[PDB]
Design a protein around this ligand. Sequence first.
Ligand SMILES: *CCC(=O)N1CCN(c2nc(OC[C@@H]3CCCN3C)nc3c2CCN(c2cccc4ccccc24)C3)C[C@@H]1CC#N
Ligand SMILES: Nc1nc2c(ncn2[C@@H]2O[C@H](COP(=O)(O)OP(=O)(O)O)[C@@H](O)[C@H]2O)c(=O)[nH]1
Ligand SMILES: [Mg+2]
Length: 169
Amino acid sequence: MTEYKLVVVGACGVGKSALTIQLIQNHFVDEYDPTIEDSYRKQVVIDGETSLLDILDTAGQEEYSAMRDQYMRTGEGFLLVFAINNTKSFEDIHHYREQIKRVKDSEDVPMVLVGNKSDLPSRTVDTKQAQDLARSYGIPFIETSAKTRQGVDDAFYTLVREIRKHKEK
Ligand SMILES: *CCC(=O)N1CCN(c2nc(OC[C@@H]3CCCN3C)nc3c2CCN(c2cccc4ccccc24)C3)C[C@@H]1CC#N
Ligand SMILES: Nc1nc2c(ncn2[C@@H]2O[C@H](COP(=O)(O)OP(=O)(O)O)[C@@H](O)[C@H]2O)c(=O)[nH]1
Ligand SMILES: [Mg+2]
């Protein structure tokens, strides 16, 4: 069976855990201990291909032990998550991109930019700014709400298709 290692990164609070549990469990968690880092496997069919998605929901502390690099480097593709109501989390996207490039030691890693909390009225990051940045990184941009499940399947499945494109090259 085909397996894909997906890693979800982005500032504390953006909804990495909420997105992952929506994908895994089909519902929304209002609280998920912000320190709990774990990976969840889910069998899915995407464009007719059965696969195991192994999803690393990143949390814990900001630290850069060799052990940390070693597990993050197992990621085949990464969701770069910010929250549309949080300007700082959008600023942080550069950091997560660079860290991916560092540990994968490559400039061609499957990534999807994810603009989460789409359900909220308090928007501070324009869709245009997000599309401009994804455009400049050469990667897709998906708007999501972990609360309503908008764009959740799309974010993950698009990342899979990005990994596929990469494996074709
Ligand atoms: C709310 C808790 C949570 O979701 N966290 C805690 C922080 N942590 C993390 N933060 C971080 O940067 C924090 C901000 C952004 C720029 C300025 N700082 C203050 N950077 C990282 C992490 C987790 C460890 N990773 C990391 C380490 C080694 C290799 C990596 C490769 C690719 C991506 C990340 C790597 C850097 C984790 C989590 C936030 C998330 N994601
Ligand atoms: N309204 C709304 N709230 C969200 C969404 N995603 C996450 N949250 C809330 O934001 C908080 C942080 O989410 P969490 O998944 O813990 O963030 P993480 O730190 O990136 O794992 C929690 O109270 C969630 O319920 C979303 O799409 N919409
Ligand atoms: Mg979390």
